[PDB]
Amino acid sequence: GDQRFGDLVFRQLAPNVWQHTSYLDMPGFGAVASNGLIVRDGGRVLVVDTAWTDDQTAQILNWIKQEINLPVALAVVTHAHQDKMGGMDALHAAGIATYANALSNQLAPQEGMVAAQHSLTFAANGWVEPATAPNFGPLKVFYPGPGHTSDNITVGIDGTDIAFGGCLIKDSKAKSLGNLGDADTEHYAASARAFGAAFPKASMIVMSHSAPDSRAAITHTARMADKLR
């Protein structure tokens, strides 16, 4: 049940969870879809990842207003590339509190991104330091190790069967690991497996560039990444 809304696509995944999809015509790579998440937690909405652009991200907020009609309490973005952080200014213009891995905020200017307002830090075992992620509700933020990028983070949704791998995870039939320009090829496989181990109950794996898949997305991604070493 995909819903076309302007140039974006929205798909309900669970009673309180929707996937947002936006597109950027990247010369040399076609019009690339990127997915994030929208989660209703009681009387507020939480967003995972921007769209590629400010205008698209404002359209996400317009869809939220029309389909949910509750305030967006915060957004968390999953690394410092345009598909995940390109719309930061639109969130700030809307008055939404924004969060990213401290490393993502440090990298943002050189990547052409605007930093989030708040920095997440992580324990040695990968779980977010809880004081840095206040009021995250059901969102469980995990740093699995370097993979697609050194700063990539992942998000589970407590109370659902959903976990979000962002650009770390590719679908179970993917032919490649995509853009490795900023990747850590030696650690990728272990990081993919650590994501799976952090969210063992998640049977629906959501990711940046394919429709939600089974956990075979994790095993297949890791198996491809074993070849990078």
Ligand X SMILES: Cc1cc(Br)c2c(CP(=O)(O)O)cc(=O)oc2c1
Which residues lie near ligand X (CB under 6 A)?
26, 29, 32, 81-83, 167, 178-179, 181, 208
Residue 148 annotated as binding site: yes
Q: Which is nearer to ligand X, 45 or 218 (CB)?
A: 218
Residue 158 annotated as binding site: no
Q: Which is nearer to ligand X, 179 or 203 (CB)?
A: 179
Distance of CA 112 to the CA centre of its chain: 18
Least Cα distance to 105 among 130, 78, 127 occurs for 78
**Binding of Zn ion at residue 81 (CB under 5 A)?**
yes
DSSP letters of 122-140? B-TTSBBPGGGSTT-TTEE
Q: Which is nearer to ligand X, 40 or 81 (CB)?
A: 81
Contact 23, 32 (CB under 8 A): yes
Q: Which is nearer to ligand X, 32 or 94 (CB)?
A: 32
Contact 182, 176 (CB under 8 A): no
DSSP letters of 148-170? SSTT--EEEETTSSEEE-GGG--
Cα torsion for 195, 153, 126, 219, to the nearest 10°?
10
181 binds, among ligand X, Zn ion, none (CB under 5 to 8 A by kind): ligand X
If binding means CB under 5 A, how many residues of this protein chain bind Zn ion? 3
Residue 216, C-beta contacts closer than 8 angstroms, at least 6 positions apart = 172
Shortest spacing between CB 22 and ligand X, in angstroms: 12
Shortest spacing between CB 135 and Zn ion, in angstroms: 26
Binding mask 155-194 toward Zn ion (x if CB under 5 A, else -) reads ------------x---------------------------
Binding residues: 79, 81, 83, 148, 167, 170, 179, 209
* Contact residues for Zn ion, defined by CB under 5 A: 81, 167, 208
